[PDB]
């Protein structure tokens, strides 16, 4: 994880790569004061027209536009990729967290140019984008919401160290000369951004681009090395959990927010508060590496967002002890292997950083099975690969003192007894040891 | 049609095959105290990556979550059919009547084990889900509404005779042995619905598994037998009507329900009193025995409601009398040829059914023909085949009194007076016919 | 422009064609009384079973029920088109003013009608449809709303010159022979508006039916002659606008309305005075003589309805100087080249119609560019091929005293000051022209 630090129009400018959605091509996060905006670039494995897809959304935390937004964002990228290239090229912007002062609009362009610059796409920026004021005949970057109604001119522009590549008004009738006074005003910070960003690429110095018989291969030998050899296609223990960690309060506009990663699975969940309980999941396609629709929640989504709700419901408090509406919504950064469990044990982080007096903490975690001719194995914490190749997907979450909430999915006609009791006693280890991390973190 | 009975957590269970919905691979009924759940089961002709879709659906009048039940039900049956098979799968749920302590998931489990037992389809079940509450220490098999607020324990187990094969949970933090102890209590009461359903199995013993040139010599040959043989591709007369079967008071908590079936052609119309007049129109695939998108209402089940809502208005009484909202809709469980017909005759039923004062009962019927040399012949109550090859769909319902609505889609240039006059007294003979049996049945 | 009219059931009856929609392969204006009806009729270029598809709609600024006012449409048209035919054949109905006493959907099917016999494609009509009432005994044409509530038959019947060819009644039990009557009185005067319509089609006399390395010496070619010997491919200079038409107040029962129309570029505008301002954007696939889907507002008609607002939203009225919404909606009929500027003249044109106390009038151009070496020409008002095979789309709107909105796509890595600067004062004078015939016109 890597910080980089500015001033941008009297407030902090922070870039932050290395941490959030590593299975993006490029990821960044983007603070401009209190606003707080996540910036994932993903091409397409292969190419495919040109094919580049830009979206923009503001959480309903944070606090037709967001359709105007993602054009405004996709026109200074737009022209510059390779004459040629051809892969899809996705890019999304998420406004976790936003002052209105501190245009979200424009913290998501650098941080789209940021995604790309260090993504690994041979993007030709980078680019920047400025709010161009004009005051009692003064110009004005990024000027806030109280300035703006005073404010002859709502432009914004867009470029590069070279040249404009994007203007975009509204003005209360102003000349030419005024207009275009105001552009090259603002291109003038457009070059003090790109210089910012190209410190941040100097630095990080990102570098640029019979079957089935075969995949039931592949499905014999991590079984055979899982069940005989003792070890999994990570290295790891048949009981061993992924890397953990975690931190609280990361958005400062929300009440509480809780980031916790396992692995190469990763999931924010952040708290509401107001003046009952409910739990969102969300599983953006960035999360795996890949591209593709932006879709309403999925059938998988409205599933694992109800199994977050129902492991955590037990433990909130009631409306005597807590006279407040809890919504919490988790957001899968990256996944492999029970993001589910994850949001889970990222929405105990956000109650406990909201100061909600929960009963207990509660985490979840989810096991898997190698079955063989005379004995099977019992998996921790599992990734997906040991999901499609073994024979459960087997998820429990709760407290110390028992279980909240079981989901289970198999391949096989069904469970003996011993395999459930030996897995649910793994599974309750396993919750007892990331609670003890949670609670380390918080 | 077979009834096959037994008792279930100290209320009644019934299920009941070979009336409804008879062109899926497979269908049955389930009644489980005022529970009523229609369950089918519909595979694609040609194998197809398995592609099996469940759902279920409760309806308005049987009185997310909808996702999270067909995903429930999924679980127990997915990892049930033989290695290899490919075919499109289809299940269907719809919830007809509701009552909240006899749950309805639960009986749309049984009764998609059911519809995929009797079906043709080569499910490796029979399988069987139960609800397991934790009150006072003691285990109970599906707890009513008011049993749950005092239970520690929300627990849905599924599975076969020989092993449990889905747990899903939630749980006031119980222990691990607590939990076990659950899911085979609830697995004794599995193997007793699951060998409930292998007695109606063994009883029913279900069997399991140019171009253009000559649709033109087939559509030459149905008319030609038609119009020179006077013979339907039935066998039928052409003034000759199917077979009619009726029922009405189907479900316990609609107002008013009629079961309508002419041949294979069969609906379900539900009416619902509140405190002007609306009629709705589902046509689902499987009433054709196909699978397929479950989308919105198109078209032509809004044209078909529509018209179905146009026939029936007319006797409907005015407020003075009769001071309530009425909403019937119409489930068409099977089609060969007028559903929009079978569905106002259905409407009737369950108007006088729920003890509307109709100022008169309505039949619908849809007329054919085929055109030839110069001569013709007029065709009642057509068949899909003889819409598909014939010349109109003339479709007249009303009283014995005179015509309430008429609807027409024809595939010659025009209908002369003479072919109009016939068929339209063809059509007052027919819903005379039909209105005869109606209140034969009413 | 060509007008034709009579007399409809005592009102008036007038068919428009000429000028407007001219890039469908048939369109036409059909007014009724204060019913203002546009009808449309494109087919594919190349043949694909045929698709046909109608549509209908009542805009909302006019004043289920869509779904079989297209349905009913489609039924007199369907079967009369050559056996074989396989070309994609849709039709566009867009109520723009509604008299409910003169059925917009009567207008619509004799619209539909003249659409397609007016456009080239082998409809073997026309035809034409009536409603039929039977009050006090007499049967009536198109009764008004009032009449309706007496009436025991509500019948709408349409045909051609030989036969009835379509029938759909509701009615309050009226016998065979009233039906049978209502129907061939219905027929009379179908075939006086079928000989009204043939009077039509006599008058106007409708005449009835390496790719890479290829496209890139096209490029080269439009660009060459553009920057060497200046000329376009109309045969334009590269500072001239197309042709100018304009009118103001087309439709009766909104409170303003503009019509502007610039080459092939056309323009309705319709505003709506409510009890704050709103500017929307409709881009029909009929604009540019296509068929397909026909979905929601897209992400350009979003953007391009916002660049009208922004250009338009600072010459509104305060609401102390006039207290009312202001809702405006752009309708593009025929495109080639900047509709959202149109929108604007057009939107422009409306307020003033209406009578709002604007600051000033507002008109908009798009400018393009084609960089040749070290050398470039800037093109006033583009066309779509010059923006296609140009370096820009550069959007400037304003008064005669500056600039209001700008919005600009370059397919070049940048834009430097002295095109911007060429950009602006062309489009400067641009507007100022634009604005001389607006004037002019109201
Ligand atoms: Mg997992
Ligand atoms: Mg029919
Ligand atoms: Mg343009």
Redesign the interface.
């Known amino acids: 994880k890597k910080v980089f630090k500015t001033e941008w129009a009297g407030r902090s400018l922070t870039i932050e790569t290395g941490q959030l959605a590593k299975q993006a091509n490029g990821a960044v996060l983007v603070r401009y004061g209190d606003t707080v905006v996540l910036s994932t670039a993903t091409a397409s494995k292969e190419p495919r027209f040109f094919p580049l897809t830009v979206n923009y959304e503001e959480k309903m935390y944070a606090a ?1 536009e967001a ?2 937004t ?2 405004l964002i996709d ?1 200074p990228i737009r ?2 990729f390779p004459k040629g290239y051809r892969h899809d090229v996705q890019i999304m912007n998420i406004v976790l967290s936003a002052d209105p002062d501190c245009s979200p609009e424009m913290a998501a362009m650098i941080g789209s140019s940021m995604a790309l610059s260090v993504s690994d796409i041979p993007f ?1 920026g980078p680019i920047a984008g400025v709010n161009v004021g004009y005051i009692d005949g003064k110009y004005v970057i990024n000027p806030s919401v109280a300035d703006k109604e005073i404010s002859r001119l709502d432009l914004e522009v867009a ?2 160290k ?15 000369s ?3 006074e105001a ?2 005003f603002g291109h003038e910070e457009i070059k003090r951004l790109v210089a910012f960003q190209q410190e941040i690429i100097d630095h990080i110095q990102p570098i640029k681009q019979v079957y089935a018989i075969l995949n039931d291969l592949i499905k014999e030998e991590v079984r055979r090395l899982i069940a005989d050899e003792k070890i999994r296609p990570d290295g790891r223990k048949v009981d061993e959990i992924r890397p953990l960690e975690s931190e609280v309060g990361l958005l400062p506009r929300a009440h509480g927010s809780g980031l916790f990663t396992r692995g190469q699975t990763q999931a924010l969940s952040v708290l509401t508060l107001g003046a009952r309980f409910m739990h969102h999941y969300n599983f953006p396609n960035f999360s795996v590496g890949e591209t593709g629709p932006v879709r309403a929640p999925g ?1 998988r989504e ?2 694992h967002g ?1 199994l977050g709700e ?2 955590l ?2 433990i909130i408090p009631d409306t005597q002890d807590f006279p407040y509406t809890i919504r919490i919504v988790s957001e899968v950064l990256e996944s492999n292997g029970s993001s589910s469990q994850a949001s889970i044990c990222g929405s105990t982080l956000a109650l406990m950083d909201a100061g909600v007096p929960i009963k ?1 903490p509660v985490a979840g975690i989810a096991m898997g099975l190698v079955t063989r001719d005379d004995s099977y194995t019992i998996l921790t914490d599992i990734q997906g690969m040991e999901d499609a190749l073994g024979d459960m997907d087997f998820k429990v979450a ?2 110390k ?17 011993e395999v ?2 030996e897995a ?2 793994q599974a ?1 280890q396993g919750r007892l040891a990331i609670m003890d991390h949670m609670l380390h973190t918080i």
Chains 1, 2, 3 share one sequence.
């Open positions: 037709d359709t105007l993602a054009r026109r022209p510059l030709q470029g590069h070279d040249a404009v590549n994007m203007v975009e008004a509204g003005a209360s009738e102003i000349t030419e005024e207009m275009l552009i090259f059938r409205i599933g109800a129902r492991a419901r037990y207990a709760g407290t003192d028992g279980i909240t909430a079981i989901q289970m999915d198999i391949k096989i006609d069904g469970l003996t007894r459930i009791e649910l006693e309750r």
